[PDB]
Design a protein around this ligand. Structure first.
Ligand SMILES: *[C@H]1O[C@H](COP(=O)(O)OP(=O)(O)OC[C@H]2O[C@@H](n3cnc4c(N)ncnc43)[C@H](O)[C@@H]2O)[C@@H](O)[C@@H]1F
Length: 252
C-alpha cells in the first residue's frame, strides 16, 4: 500500500520470535535470571500493547512485564547515556566496569526494536507504528522506555555516570529522554554524584566541553536536586577504549 496509518516504522520483523530468543539467551548467560520463564515474559510483553490503541499506552500496561523482569543491578555501577548508546555499550563490554539499561533483561529484550498493535484486533502492526513527534507520545515503544528507564534511574546510587555526545548541537538536551526522565528519577537520598563523560566527536584538539552552556544547565539541574555534578572530557573515544582494554600498561 501507498500510505500507512502511522508516520513511523512498523514492528521489527519477526518481533515475537526475536524477543523470545533474546529472553532465552539473556537468561542462559545471566544466572541471576536463569529461572525466568521466557514464555511468561513474552505473554506479559504482548499483553502491554496487543489489542490496545497504540496512542493510548500507559505505564500500567507494562506492569506485568516490569514485575517479571524485576532484576538487581549493582546500583553504584550504573552508566546512563544520551544519544551515544554505541560507545556506552562498547565500553561496558570490555570488563563490565559499568551496566547500561541494555545490560538488564528488559533493556536487552527491546534494544533497537520497534513494535505496536491495533485497537480491537490482536494483530501486531508490521506496517507502521506511531512516531513520537508526528503521531503520539504515548506509543508502545516510548512508554516502554520511559517506564523501564524510570525504574533503572530510581535504582542508582553513589556515583552514577552518563555518556553524552559532545558532537551534538545540545550536548545535554533538557528535552531528550535522558533529560526529561532519567535525570528526574535519580534519588537524591541515594545518589551522591552524577558524572558526565562528554564524548568528543571532533578529531584531535577541541574545547573544554565541560564548559558548554548545556553542561552548565545539567549541572544546575542536578545541583538543585542536592546531587553533586562532575564532568570529564573524553577527547578521543578510540584512545579511551584502548586504555580501558589495556589500562596504563600503555600511553594512558
Ligand atoms: C532513558 O534515556 C536514555 C535515552 O536518552 P536519549 O537522550 O538518547 O533519548 P532521546 O534521543 O530523546 O530518545 C531516544 C528514544 O529511543 C528509545 N530508546 C531508549 N533506549 C533504546 C534502545 N536501547 N533501543 C531503541 N530505542 C531506545 C526511547 O523511546 C527514547 O525515548 C535511555 O537509556 C532510556 F530510554
Amino acid at each position: 500500500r501507498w500510505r500507512q496509518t502511522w508516520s513511523g516504522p512498523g514492528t521489527t520483523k519477526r518481533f515475537p520470535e526475536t524477543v523470545l530468543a533474546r529472553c532465552v539467551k539473556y537468561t542462559e548467560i545471566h544466572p541471576e535470571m536463569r529461572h525466568v520463564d521466557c514464555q511468561s515474559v513474552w505473554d506479559a510483553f504482548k499483553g502491554a500493547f496487543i489489542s490496545k490503541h497504540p496512542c493510548d499506552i500507559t505505564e500500567e500496561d507494562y506492569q506485568p512485564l516490569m514485575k517479571l523482569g524485576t532484576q538487581t543491578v549493582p546500583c553504584n555501577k550504573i552508566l546512563l547515556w544520551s544519544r551515544i548508546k554505541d560507545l556506552a555499550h562498547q565500553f561496558t563490554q570490555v570488563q563490565r566496569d559499568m551496566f547500561t539499561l541494555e545490560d538488564t533483561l528488559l533493556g536487552y529484550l527491546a534494544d533497537d526494536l520497534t513494535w505496536c498493535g491495533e485497537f480491537d484486533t490482536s494483530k501486531i502492526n508490521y506496517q507502521s507504528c506511531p512516531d513520537w513527534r508526528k503521531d503520539c507520545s504515548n506509543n508502545p515503544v516510548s512508554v516502554f522506555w520511559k517506564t523501564v528507564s524510570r525504574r533503572f534511574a530510581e535504582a542508582a546510587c553513589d556515583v552514577v555516570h552518563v555518556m553524552l555526545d559532545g558532537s551534538r548541537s545540545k550536548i545535554f538536551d533538557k528535552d531528550s529522554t535522558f533529560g526529561s526522565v532519567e535525570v528526574h528519577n535519580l534519588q537524591p537520598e541515594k545518589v551522591q554524584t552524577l558524572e558526565a563523560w562528554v564524548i568528543h566527536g571532533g578529531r584531535e584538539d577541541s574545547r573544554d566541553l565541560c564548559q558548554d552552556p548545556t553542561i552548565k544547565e545539567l549541572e544546575s539541574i542536578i545541583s538543585k536536586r542536592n546531587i553533586q555534578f562532575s564532568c570529564k572530557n573524553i577527547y578521543r573515544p578510540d584512545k579511551f577504549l584502548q586504555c580501558v582494554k589495556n589500562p596504563e600498561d600503555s600511553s594512558c
